[model samples]
Target chain A: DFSRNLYDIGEQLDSEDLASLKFLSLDYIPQRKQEPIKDALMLFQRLQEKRMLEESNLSFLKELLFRINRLDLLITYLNTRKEEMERELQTPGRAQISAYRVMLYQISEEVSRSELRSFKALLQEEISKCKLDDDMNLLDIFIEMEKRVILGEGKLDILKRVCAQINKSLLKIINDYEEFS
Target chain B: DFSRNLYDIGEQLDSEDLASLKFLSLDYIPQRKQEPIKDALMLFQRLQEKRMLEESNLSFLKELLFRINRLDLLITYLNTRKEEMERELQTPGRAQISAYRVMLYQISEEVSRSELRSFKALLQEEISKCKLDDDMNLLDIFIEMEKRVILGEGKLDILKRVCAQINKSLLKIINDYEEFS
Candidate 1:
């Protein structure tokens, strides 16, 4: 039904209508031709209102996409189509970019959830063994922590800082705490 | 001592004596070559007698070959030399072929053991849920079983036959019991 509605709009707009719309949007608007400019502005306003409603309803689609494991498709479509949508609006700004970023974050979160589950399982088995050989164990922990970061946990800065902390602790343990353990 | 014995043999033989020994060993023993042939025969007899001691040493070597963790290196070396060995033997009999086959089986066993250990360790974690799907579970089981067949006490033929039997059972289960399950 949704695809049919889209097809209907595509069919309604003939080549001539598209050409006229493009000319009115680009040429007439720039030249400030009052009558055609007003009509074009109204058309643009209608599109913006419709798109606002579509964007508002996108959360449900996002949930569906998640359930179906089509998050990548959803993300790619949004990312590719976003620029065109912004161009059509004639005043794309940081707000639109922020919305896109948030959507991408949600997608990233879902992927991270999957990765975390797998890696955590691996770490659970290794965590006890970490104390066995200090160097190897510390290395294993570092690898797991890095996996979490690469999967999109916390911030990149935080991830790098955590890695630095691990590296320092590992070196100190090897050098300073050699006799303690 | 071994090198000294080889040096002694070289010193005792003139060029003619050496050539005759090599020729007589092939066929058509020369009359003057009788004493040389006797010496060569005595040497071969002594070597054969020494082989009893060397056989035990060779058995130890074979055991070490089996015990080593890096059997893959041995397996690969043997595999790489297979064509040369085959050419040397010139269509080796079943016993000769079986010797190589057994070594291959031993190498396969080692690889299977390592992979199975890793898989079992993975299964202990929540990521085991990732393997909850039927195909994933079956793959895990198949790999585990393959490892077991390689390592478990039994004849290679017995293990291979048992695998076939188990496969038949699994096919029956998937064909008939999957729906009920």
Candidate 2:
């Protein structure tokens, strides 16, 4: 049922919809595994392998749709309402997305295009193996940092340093992450 | 429903049962995370975090009980049967236990008392950081080797070498692991 539902949902999802989902699942799926996922179903399949999403539990998907402001997916495919999801997620530890993951997303949102340029340069200098391509965004750089062992759930020192150098708001987001944990 | 069932199942489990379940969940929970777990429910909680155990999927718990010859629990708690589980496991990729994990357990079973003595002595010589304590068994040593990066699925060269020096039978078990993978 989960697989079938995801297949249907995948058919409905646009490219940007897939992008929102990939961001939501940043913590659950490794960046390497997230690569080459060309559709929503394939992305959901990878999330299933990690047991982050399941047929019995659509909370993760609902949460993703909610974060992306696609309440249409929530109502049509999920039969979930925005108000109900908001209430549930407000309860302690009920969130499908990790607080740290959200903070990283929040940081990405706050970073300007020029700030992303700075982040990419700082990352290339800090991490020897990672290639900061022209097309790569802040989120992409974050994933590369994760692959390089410079970022993770609890390890945010390097990220903090880079964020501190680039902008004050990014560090504030990370500090909020630490406070939540 | 999964959480409730596990709590009920945890209530019925004894110390030995918990130990067996912990061994079955070795692949799911990290050694550091598994350390403070004191009971069946706590162990199940760790497995749930890894998505190895789910309310909707009791196959993992059922498989564990079957491995430890506790089909009584399967019939009682899981309401499953040996023949049914055996049949289900025979299906490709349906197995809750990894082939590599079963191979390691098989290796532990084949080692003799004297062979364990040889294994222990050889380990201390190989891993500089690990302390081979009096209470640490072959399984415990395997966990330590996993922690030290000497032993894991597909990286069994160090394990194969040690086993070859101690006994040919152990080498045969590891080779079986290689063949299966």
Candidate 3:
């Protein structure tokens, strides 16, 4: 029941971080202990569910972050949770946008410079051709960029200005969405 | 005899650039022309030999550099060649060090930050444990670092300071070696 109220915090994490959480279950948890820690065991099962937690399991989430050595992510998640709780409006969408922005920045850093430029341009073009309010469309753009890069289409030196423009737009969108909350 | 003097230049290039040179041999030379370009065809064959060009092949090298969009690499290589030629002592060893430094930097860029740190540290530790004049040992260190990174041991975030220290040492080595030329 510890995670009963804080379970939704899992939804605020991006797919990569969620995937990392899965590793904690497989690697860190002691399954054969004499007295199995019920809370830890239960949290481990929840991590494998692939669905967002149903409650506010703050301690469980914090422990996972601690095990991963990602206290920064924990701080961010907690701050976002506090803001949403204070507003009492359940503005989880704004938190999701922030998480996505962080994920995008990490992806940009992880990729080669030329590939990063191309990915940014692809995302920008997709966003322009579709409605900004459509979250699924935005996600589709990310998926398409990943596919192209993985398939080696990212070796081409596409337009740098388009990449910069898209980065600006993403930042602007994130900031604007934050204000809405 | 056009490429007879220029055949050695291929050895001076890193493997990626050398592979690109192979493409020039397969595509740039017109094998079906009735009056075949002897110079181009001969140069193409020489590029296949993994050796550096002789002293008399500057023009051939320049043309190849122009064909590829790697004029910067050409400039650096040419400057190194000019320095060696002027000294007349055949201090090709220093030039090789410069080339290796460039290759190392390129490799560092290709890897993740954590892996880069591990590789740099590995190189640094090996260099410090051996005599400064041991060029073969230095090369062995590079090869070992590459093997570890490729084998996934580099993901272990070995000391960050070691990475910075190795970078400094590499820059210093390059600058000092260039001065000798």
Candidate 4:
């Protein structure tokens, strides 16, 4: 039933909304279903299947639930999701850096050389500005940077370089952070 | 007083407005004054100082006067401005092509080569779609195209190329139109 709602919500969401959802890391749903309640249940099932989840996704889901007037079910679901994600974070996937690197190359194919250079500089500046906080995570910063590239009209080639720079920066931080944890 | 208002209006108008005003072929005046009626006379003096005028400028001034709640005075001013601009367009400026070309190059510097090519194709398509009317002039079409380039986020390079393409198209049209006139 829950999965049905999830599918409906995803179907109704526009590209921009989907991008936002992806940024929030709530796009990790697995199976699909029909009917609102069944779709919503599928979302829950997908959440349960994931060993770890980002806190940002949980918060975003909580907000989305509230907006949809579904806070009644979200409270318990959010709690469970968070607990599982925290446990999953303990193992911190090793392939994350390579995945980001791949994305960086994909985005870079869109801009000119000069634009790519400037984009790299901008990404570096963003990396330097990223301050660690309990509420903000690496994924959030990366997502924000990606959004800037899109909104700022950065050439795709430039965007690709930016993604590369971000991946490089994240590689060090994610490793250090996970080791410390 | 009229001259004072004219000056005030001109002062308040930005470069874009000034360009529009210039295109109207205004700035031809014949006399000066102190009183409200006499001040209006000075606006005529300023107009005479300019050797040529553009009619579109007169119509725009009429609209401007209406917006400023000065319809009473605009009636005479608009009539005079229109007569002068019509005469000026009869002699039609020779350097309009170069001017547009410069603008095209300026806009082109902002976008990638491929994007510029695509933008030019789009502009060509738009040009083909343009149906001539008594009220719609070539400049209006070009201006609309320029606006699209700006709004469409065509890189400066793309814009310049599009402009070049537009200029090429306009060159033939302007020549044929002027010769016919």
Q: What is the iRMSD of the candidate numbered 3?
A: 25.4
Q: Each model's C-alpha lDDT? A: 0.33, 0.62, 0.36, 0.35
C-alpha positional error of residue B11 in candidate 4 after TM-score superposition, expressed in Å: 7.7
Q: Please report the candidate that would top lDDT against the real structure.
A: 2
DockQ of 2: 0.01
Q: What ordering of candidates by lDDT runs from best to worst?
A: 2, 3, 4, 1
Per-residue alpha-carbon lDDT of model 1 for B31-137, expressed as tens digits? 22334434533534433354521422322222222333323432542222333333444544412222322322232233333443332243223222222232322
Q: Where does model 1 sit among the CAPRI classes?
A: incorrect
Superposed by TM-score, candidate 4 places the C-alpha of residue B142 at a distance from the truth, in angstroms, of 46
Predicted candidate 3 versus true structure: per-residue lDDT over A40-120, tens digit per residue: 334545544534332454443544554344555556655534333334323444222122222222322244445434433
Question: What is candidate 1's DockQ?
Answer: 0.01
Q: Which 10 successive residues of model 4 chain A have the least lDDT summed?
A: A97-106
Which has the better TM-score: candidate 2, or candidate 4? 2
- Model 4 C-alpha lDDT per residue in residues A1-181, reported as the tens digit of each score: 4555445544544433332223223234411221222333344444545733333445435544333334344444444344343444345452232222222222323334554344334323332332333443222322333333321222233323332343344234333333433
- lDDT score for residue A44 of model 4: 43
Worst 10 residues of 1 chain B by lDDT: B150-159
Q: Cα miss at B68, model 3 (Å)?
A: 55
Q: Rank the candidates by TM-score, best first.
A: 2, 3, 4, 1
Q: For candidate 2, what is the TM-score? A: 0.34
The Cα error of candidate 2 at residue A91, in Å, is 0.5
What's the lDDT for residue B69 in model 3?
46
